[PDB]
Amino acid sequence: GPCYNPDAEYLPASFKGFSFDADSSDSDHGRNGAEAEFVFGERTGYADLGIKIKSYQLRARFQTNDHIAQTNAFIAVLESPGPGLLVHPTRGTVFAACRSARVTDSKVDAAGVTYVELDFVEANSVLSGFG
Amino acid sequence: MIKPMRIFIGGEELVTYTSAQLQRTKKQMTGSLTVEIFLDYVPTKPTIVNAVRGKEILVYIMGELAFTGAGGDVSVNFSKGNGYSVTLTARGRTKYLIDSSQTHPTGFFKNTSDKKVIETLVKEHNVVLQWDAEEIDEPKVTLRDGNRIYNEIFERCNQNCHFAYETRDGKLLITDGTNGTVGEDIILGYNILDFS
């Protein structure tokens, strides 16, 4: 649209309480099943087996005079034990667990900015025992 | 020509065998052929089968006999993507001696020799014996009731050293030494693809 205010339409991202500014937002929905291919046959089958586990991928940026301290704090938060609450900019609140966080940080090529490529997975609670 | 094999289930020179493994050994009485045939299936046209479960084969290796004896089994497989294969297996003609059960009337050979007790434990299924060791005499030979045509021979040729195996023609060789016939000096660096 012509009068689309982005930051009034995208939610400010944050994981486990710590807030940050995100640069991308993805998702990996799906529906998994089997696929039957009976021999010598002009026919095919399909069987729905359940829900494909959701996964989110983000890219956070840090462009500030103290981006090193912010990135260190964000690393310390991401390595906290157990899954926590994530605010996906376009999917709202979910419960995810961090799975990888690459921290690109160059000096003689681009000093000042630090990028973090984050990879979260829908982590739903369980009930210990045999549920 | 590199061409080693030409198999004959009866005269049908196999030209479709996608693979093959032929094993011969002295530690045992037989061998083990294992052919792999294609066997297509067009689900509208007529198709023909071969239920051999016993139809006799040989494997002339590199223009010379190697084996002699699809008796083993037929193993028609299936799959969607690489299916329609037929693994045929073929033991050696000295097999029924392995999977039978002695049916000699008496059961008590008296004043016989191991050669004779072996000749009458084999000539019940027409397997000519290539006796090339010696004649040992023994008073009492009682066969355990229906033991096995091969256990009894193995017992009778182990207490008097005699290797018992099968040749390339289709006979039972009861030897005491070697088959002579010396050959290639395999040297490390000359032909050994691998050694252990």
Shortest CA gap A36–chain B (Å)? 10
Beta-carbon separation of B41 and A40 below 8 A: yes
Beta-carbon separation of B41 and A38 below 8 A: no
d(CA B159, CA B157): 6
Beta-carbon separation of A40 and B79 below 8 A: no
For residue B83, list chain A residues with Cβ-Cβ distance below 8 A.
Answer: 39
Tell me the CA distances in angstroms from A10 to A91, A92, B173, one per residue in order.
9, 9, 88
Shortest CA gap A47–chain B (Å)? 18
Q: Indicate the Cα dihedral angle A36, A38, A41, A47, nearest 10°.
A: -20
Residue B155: DSSP 8-state? H
Tell me the CA distances in angstroms from B77 to B37, B38, B51, B86, B89, one per residue in order.
11, 10, 14, 6, 14
For residue A38, list chain B residues with Cβ-Cβ distance below 8 A.
Answer: 80
List the single best residue of B39, B79, B80 to mutate versus A (max A Cβ within 10 A).
Answer: B80
Specify the DSSP element, H or E, that contains B79. Answer: none
* Residues across chain B: 196
Per CB distance under 8 Å, which residues of B are interface residues toward A?
Answer: 41, 43, 78-80, 83
Tokens standing for B4?
């080693």
Q: Indicate the Cα dihedral angle A113, A114, A120, A125, nearest 10°.
A: -110
For residue B85, list chain A residues with Cβ-Cβ distance below 8 A.
Answer: none
Residue B188: DSSP 8-state? T
Shortest CA gap B16–chain A (Å)? 22
Q: Which residue of A has its CA nearest to B41?
A: A40
- A40 touches B: beta carbon within 8 Å: yes
Beta-carbon separation of A37 and B83 below 8 A: no
- CB pairs A-B closer than 8 Å: 8
For residue B78, list chain A residues with Cβ-Cβ distance below 8 A.
Answer: 39
DSSP for A14-59, written as a single string: EETTEE--EEEE-------EEEE--TT-S--EEEE---PPPEEEEE
Tell me the CA distances in angstroms from A64 to A12, A67, A75, A102, A111, one per residue in order.
17, 5, 17, 19, 11
Q: Indicate the Cα dihedral angle B53, B57, B61, B62, nearest 10°.
A: -120
d(CA A85, CA A73): 17
d(CA B111, CA A127): 82
> CB neighbours (10 Å) of residue A58?
21
Shortest CA gap B42–chain A (Å)? 8
Task: Choose among A114, A112, A113, A98: nearest CA to A58.
Answer: A98
Q: First-to-last CA distance in chain B?
A: 30
Count CA within 13 A, CB hemisphere, residue A102: 6
Work out the burial of residue A95: count CB atoms within 10 Å of its CB; fewer than 13 is exposed, 13-18 middle, 19 or more buried: middle
User: 3-state DSSP helix/strand/coil percent for chain A, to nearest 5?
Assistant: 10, 40, 50
